[PDB]
């Protein structure tokens, strides 16, 4: 719900300059419409997905140990907090899952390259900031 902290850690995880990755960025079709009120089940799914995304072996390969840990533990509390309040539209939750496969597909295509990873890091930042 409050992605400030996450956004900061993300901006700091950068290793390459996007200004060197001029032929890598991709529009992933973020389903922005599902966040304009925004159902919590789907906030949850967003954070949930981001968490699956960055706790892989490939992730741990790409990012700094310290930063990534702070980042992941934040997602970890966000999740727990979110999860309380989800006591109680599978259409939205689905669009979020799809979007995130478009992302891993991407990463696979690009052989998990540093430039590809920057694209993605930033892509998450965008989605985070657009989810509030």
């Amino acid at each position: 719900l409050d992605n400030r902290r996450t956004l900061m850690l993300l901006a700091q995880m950068s290793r390459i300059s996007p200004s060197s990755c001029l032929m890598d960025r991709h529009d992933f079709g973020f389903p922005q419409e599902e966040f304009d009120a925004p159902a919590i089940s789907v906030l949850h799914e967003l954070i949930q997905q981001i968490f699956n995304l960055f706790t892989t072996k490939d992730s741990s390969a790409a990012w700094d140990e310290d930063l990534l840990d702070k980042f992941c533990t934040e997602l970890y509390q966000q999740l727990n907090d979110l999860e309380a309040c989800v006591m109680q539209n599978a259409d939205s939750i689905l669009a979020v899952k799809k979007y995130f496969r478009r992302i891993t597909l991407y990463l696979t295509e690009k052989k998990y390259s540093p430039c590809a990873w920057e694209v993605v890091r930033a892509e998450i930042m965008r989605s985070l900031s657009l989810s509030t």
Partner: single-chain antibody, 228 residues
Framework: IVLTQPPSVSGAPGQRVTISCSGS????????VSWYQQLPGTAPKLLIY???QRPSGVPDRFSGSKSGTSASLAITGLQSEDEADYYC???????????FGGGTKLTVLEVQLVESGGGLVQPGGSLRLSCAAS????????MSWVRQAPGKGLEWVSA????????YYADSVKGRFTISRDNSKNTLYLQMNSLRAEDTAVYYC????????????WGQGTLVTVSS
């Protein structure tokens, strides 16, 4: 190669009007779209980026949209000051090139870039363009050159990474032009060789934000004319 908009559109004040951008999916389908506005005489200014995002000072009657393989700029509460040319822009994953639409003439009822070196030359001649940059950390931004021929719309020419290790060119100028950079002196260059009469145009340098999906800032341009 191409990315089409309606050559002209008009509306009355207070009206709402729409400007279409229709592309392939090697570009629009794949990539984030930006829009640029160009008042008569002025350099283009960024108007919409990442499909629907709006820069700082831009009124909110301006909105962007993307739908599979086409973009759309929408203006509401139309006003006489919106009279300008409007350009969509996007990267094309096939050609490894940026590209502008043919533009649309809308008829209504601290950072600095300074290009130099322009001038007048014989076909087959040579010129070197400089762009003096200031008000930001230059190394950290990719740059581009973009030209507008007499009476025509925007055409992307060349681009170069923050470091300098990556360069990109439009077919038009491939191998004749060479984009350079000296980050110790905050200058972008463009060596133009074997000049042609079609190279005639105002040359803008422009600063790429991040992954080069859009450029937020433009110089005022230097005029380059090629005549026998």
């Amino acid at each position: 190669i191409v990315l089409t908009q309606p050559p002209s559109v008009s509306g009355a004040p207070g009206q709402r009007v729409t400007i279409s951008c229709s592309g392939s999916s090697s570009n629009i389908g794949s990539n984030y779209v930006s829009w640029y506005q160009q008042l008569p005489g002025t350099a283009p200014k960024l108007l919409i980026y990442d499909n629907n995002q709006r820069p700082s000072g831009v009124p909110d009657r301006f909105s962007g949209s993307k739908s599979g393989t086409s973009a759309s700029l929408a203006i509401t509460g139309l006003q006489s000051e919106d009279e300008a040319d409007y350009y969509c822009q996007v990267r094309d994953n096939n050609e490894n090139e940026w590209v502008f639409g043919g533009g649309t003439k809308l008829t209504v009822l601290e950072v600095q870039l300074v290009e130099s070196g322009g001038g007048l030359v014989q076909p087959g001649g040579s010129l070197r363009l400089s762009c003096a940059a200031s008000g930001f950390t230059f190394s950290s931004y990719a740059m581009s050159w973009v030209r507008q021929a007499p009476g025509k719309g925007l055409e992307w020419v060349s681009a170069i990474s923050g470091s300098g290790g990556s360069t990109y060119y439009a077919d038009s100028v491939k191998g004749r032009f060479t984009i350079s950079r000296d980050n110790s002196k905050n200058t972008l260059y463009l060596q133009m060789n074997s000049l042609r009469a079609e190279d005639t145009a105002v040359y803008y340098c422009a600063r790429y934000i991040d992954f080069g999906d859009h450029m937020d800032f433009w110089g005022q341009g230097t005029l380059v004319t090629v005549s026998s």
